[PDB]
Amino acid sequence: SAVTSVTQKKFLCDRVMWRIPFSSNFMSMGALTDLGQNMLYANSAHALDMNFEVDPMDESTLLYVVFEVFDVVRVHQPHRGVIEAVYLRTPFSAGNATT
Amino acid sequence: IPANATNVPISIPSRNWAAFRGWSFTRLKTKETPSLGSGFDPYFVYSGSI
């Protein structure tokens, strides 16, 4: 006396942020990807966009997109009681400090 | 993301993309995310895990 029944199947992930590399192989071979070095070669300035399909939420929700860059401080003391730090970020900047 | 939206519009200007790495993304809830644009939000009424 088992009733007719259909599968529902799903997954969860918690504490994970999705990762889409920027590589041709989709895998790391160094921290500076091979497609970051092909825009060094030539660039006309390209404009990005994405679309996303997100499941409905009764609650208000936000999307958080992280664009993975380099944020590197070079910091030096040339004399006693002196500190000077230059801040360089690569493709994004958004009014980046000390440029 | 408005309530009950199924599409999110993204807009990024023309920029050099030299030394770009991946993308990473996750979805949050509005009430569970404080704004760091100011040092006090009178609309952050959530004290749970951010």
């Binding site: 990762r19 590399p21 790391s28 921290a31 | -």
Partner: peptide, 26 residues
């Protein structure tokens, strides 16, 4: 790589006659 961590100009060494730490620069 996927998140940065590339650092370190170090190897470490201990001169012989036992392992005797510090060469104190050569």
């Amino acid at each position: 790589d996927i998140n940065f961590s590339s650092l370190a100009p170090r190897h470490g060494t201990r001169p012989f006659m036992g392992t005797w730490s510090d060469i104190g620069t050569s």
